């Protein structure tokens, strides 16, 4: 399928961003879209070969696309603004204007901020299953809570005994705003891992909650006395209790 | 030609899910396209057709003789088929534009409910877990801004054939797993030890 | 092969020399229209067709594809080049020639391959510019082309014309002469 | 000595008995050689030359390409034919007939007519003349008009009336232009 890089990009206003798309092999038509929520699919530009027939649809002169290729495409937003924030989707068909199927990539979640003061990594905490739950239904649900993070660019995952698990896992599809009143409000996300009574009661079992945060890079300038809120993994581990 | 679709639909897993779409003003060169979008990722192409009936390994597509109506059939609904479904009328000249779509929800067949609210300890502040409730019971948002209630999401223990519903609540106010979820509200069978 | 009417919807041409392209629609061997790729606009050759609209983006995306298809065949055929075919030049009048009455001179360049030619009107070595027009390259069944050039004239007994045709298939420019009689 | 590489794509529609018979033959050519083609009657891509075998194999493996090509007979041929029913196929330009001695020779100029269907008959005093007649082929002016010049080797006497009889679809009755010695 269609590839997109980077998956996420949290940046300060005025800094330039470069988005990349790798279309499906044999796809001469490449399309660039952006999508906000609550909102729909917004057309930016498209290519047929290495030339862009539809340059209109781009929000400003800051926005430009290239496909010298004419395979891989790059969209550049020089001097980024808050309003530029969205999921930037890329698509590809065999050919343009033939009503051919457009296959989309995974998108690039771009978030542009006024200042980096509001940016914070999450606080991960794993909660031991209730003994009342283990007594009543012989099942153990451990809750994970990632809190106080800004912006909402997080990937939650569960790892049992060093390897990732998906069975008996439920993660909130969207984080909630802690103070929905505040403009640059911090976010919170929860997840659940359900296992048997015996599996949790077994002390040779290690359950870790991994949270991939997307923030700053080494390139970006951090002035505050606080620790630089860089792109990082924040974990919370717990062991089986008898 | 624009398409119309039911804003939302709740269908049970294990059975086919027929999603309708009306497009009375479709033109002869317009394809009926279906995409889906899982909260909130790249849109996924499912199927398309002109006049004929089409079958993917993902879905089937039935278009009426007049082409004014169409149905997308998810052969065997699963929890994964929960997404926003977009039926679009597409021709060459045009750009791809999604409508409002159908908010399809695939509900689990909870064989035996055991509603309960539990309290968990950090390996402060403790969390309230409202699990094993029925799929017909829907949870309401938190009123007070300093007590947080996460929307219900369905859990699947594949290795057990068992599925369960779960909502999570946590706060820092007057440290509360008793009167919590008073806005939803939980069934009379819900027990708190 | 055999039918009442034959149309091309359309004639898509692209070649390495220039590079250049040509998009046209033909109906019963006559040019319905052409898209000006540079100006990005549709030019109709029959006035009754001017009531219709042709999206030039079809021509431009079509040629963009042909540019891809050509480079693919250059590679696949270890650069098998086009063969320069000797064109056929014929000059005639649109209507019977009368010394008073105005007319048009038609210069037909047939069996054009590759489709790259210069068709100029001369009169005692000087070039005629006022009143000259041309067709696009018109397709042929053997995948060769033809072009026609029109020169408006007022027949006179002492004014003769030449049609200068420059094609790689010709060792020297071909000059087809027209004497008024 | 310039080297050229040419690629053509022709979307050809063949019509017979109005709307009764319709056929699409999409031809892909490199340079004067048709390599692959989509024929509405075969209903799939087929290689014409071993150069088009990779394209025929690729495009035939894509159901999406195959189904749009199969829809094109209705989308392009049948649809475009309905515009011609109101425009190009409604075009009738009555021929201008003229006799001028070129005498031992009589030339019947049948100029500026549309469509191509034409019959030109010579007559020397109501009897038809065939042996001493020679015609040009049907000439295409390229400006959506045809012309045909029909000569007759004559040897006139006092009392001879030479007549040129012309039939065309645009005419209610045939045109007869006379010439006298």
């Amino acid at each position: 399928g269609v590839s997109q890089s980077p998956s996420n990009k949290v940046t300060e206003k005025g800094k330039d961003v470069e988005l990349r798309c790798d279309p499906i092999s044999g796809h001469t038509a490449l399309y660039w879209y952006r999508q906000s929520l609550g909102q729909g699919l917004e057309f930016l530009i498209y290519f047929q070969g290495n030339s862009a027939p539809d340059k209109s649809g781009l929000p400003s002169d800051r926005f430009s696309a290239e496909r010298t290729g004419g395979s891989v495409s790059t969209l550049t937003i020089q001097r980024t603004q808050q309003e530029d924030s969205a999921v930037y989707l890329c698509a590809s068909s065999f050919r343009a204007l033939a009503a051919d199927t457009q296959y989309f990539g995974p998108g690039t979640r771009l978030t542009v901020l006024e200042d980096l003061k509001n940016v914070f990594p999450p606080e991960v905490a794993v909660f031991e299953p209730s003994e009342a739950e283990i007594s009543h239904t012989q099942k153990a649900t451990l809750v994970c809570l990632a809190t106080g993070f800004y912006p909402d660019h997080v990937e939650l995952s569960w790892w049992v005994n060093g390897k990732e698990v998906h069975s008996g896992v439920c993660t909130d599809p969207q984080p909630l705003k802690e103070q929905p009143a505040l403009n640059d409000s911090r976010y919170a996300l929860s997840s659940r891992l359900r296992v048997s009574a015996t599996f949790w009661q077994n002390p040779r079992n290690h359950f870790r909650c991994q949270v991939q945060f997307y923030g700053l890079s080494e390139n970006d300038e951090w002035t505050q006395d606080r620790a630089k809120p860089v792109t990082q993994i924040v974990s919370a581990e717990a062991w089986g209790r008898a | 030609m624009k398409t119309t679709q039911p804003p939302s639909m709740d269908c049970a897993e294990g059975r086919a899910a027929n999603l309708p779409c009306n497009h009375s003003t479709i033109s002869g060169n317009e394809y009926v396209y279906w995409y889906r979008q899982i909260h909130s990722q790249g849109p996924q192409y499912i199927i398309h057709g002109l006049k004929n009936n089409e079958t993917n390994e993902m879905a089937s597509l039935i278009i009426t003789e007049d082409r004014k109506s169409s149905t997308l059939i998810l052969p065997h609904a699963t929890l994964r088929d929960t997404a926003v479904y977009y039926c679009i009328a597409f021709q060459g000249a045009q750009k791809l534009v999604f409508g409002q779509g159908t908010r399809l929800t695939i509900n689990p067949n909870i064989q035996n409910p055991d509603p309960a609210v539990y309290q968990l300890r950090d390996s402060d502040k403790s969390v309230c877990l409202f699990t094993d409730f029925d799929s017909q019971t829907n949870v309401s948002q938190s009123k007070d801004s300093d007590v947080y209630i996460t929307d219900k999401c369905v859990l699947d223990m594949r290795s057990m054939d068992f599925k369960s519903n779960s909502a999570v609540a946590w706060s820092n106010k007057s440290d509360a797993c008793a009167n919590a979820f008073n806005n939803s509200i939980i069934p009379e069978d819900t027990f708190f030890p | 092969i055999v039918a009442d009417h034959v149309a091309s919807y359309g004639v898509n041409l692209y070649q390495s020399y220039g590079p250049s392209g040509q998009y046209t629609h033909e109906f019963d061997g006559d040019e319905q229209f052409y898209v000006d790729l540079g100006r990005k606009e549709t030019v109709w050759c029959l006035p009754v067709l001017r009531q219709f609209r042709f999206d030039p983006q079809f021509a431009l995306t079509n040629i963009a594809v042909l540019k891809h298809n050509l480079n693919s065949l250059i590679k696949r055929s270890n650069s098998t080049a086009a063969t320069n075919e000797v064109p056929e030049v014929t000059v005639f009048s649109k209507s019977p020639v009368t010394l008073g009455q105005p007319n048009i001179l038609i210069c037909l360049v047939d069996n054009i391959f590759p489709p790259v030619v210069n068709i100029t009107w001369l009169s005692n070595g000087h070039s005629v510019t006022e009143g000259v027009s041309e067709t696009s390259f018109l397709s042929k069944s053997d995948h060769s082309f033809f072009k026609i050039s029109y020169l408006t004239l007022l027949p006179s007994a002492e004014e003769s014309y030449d049609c200068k045709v420059e094609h790689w298939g010709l060792d020297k420019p071909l000059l087809k002469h027209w004497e008024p009689e | 000595s310039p080297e050229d590489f040419v690629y053509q794509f022709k979307g050809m529609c063949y019509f017979t008995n109005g709307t009764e018979r319709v056929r699409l033959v999409s031809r892909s050519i490199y340079n004067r050689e048709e390599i692959v083609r989509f024929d509405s009657d075969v209903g799939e891509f087929r290689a014409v030359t071993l150069l088009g075998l990779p394209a025929a194999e690729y495009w035939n493996s894509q159901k999406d390409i195959l189904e749009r090509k199969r829809a094109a007979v209705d989308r392009v041929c049948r649809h475009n034919y309905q515009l011609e029913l109101r425009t190009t196929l409604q075009r009738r330009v009555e021929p201008t007939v003229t006799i001028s001695p070129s005498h031992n020779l009589l030339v019947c100029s049948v100029t500026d007519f549309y469509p191509a269907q034409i019959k030109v008959r010579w007559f020397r005093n109501d009897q038809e003349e065939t042996a001493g007649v020679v015609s040009t082929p049907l000439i295409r002016n390229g400006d959506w008009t045809f012309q045909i010049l029909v000569m007759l080797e004559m040897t006139p006497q006092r009392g001879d009336v030479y007549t040129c009889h012309v039939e065309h679809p645009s005419l209610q009755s045939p045109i007869t232009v006379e010439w006298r010695a």
Partner: peptide, 13 residues
């Protein structure tokens, strides 16, 4: 109206 036939990409240059 008028509608064009469409050439497809040749594999793969």
């Amino acid at each position: 109206a008028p509608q064009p036939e469409l050439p497809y990409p040749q594999p793969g240059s």
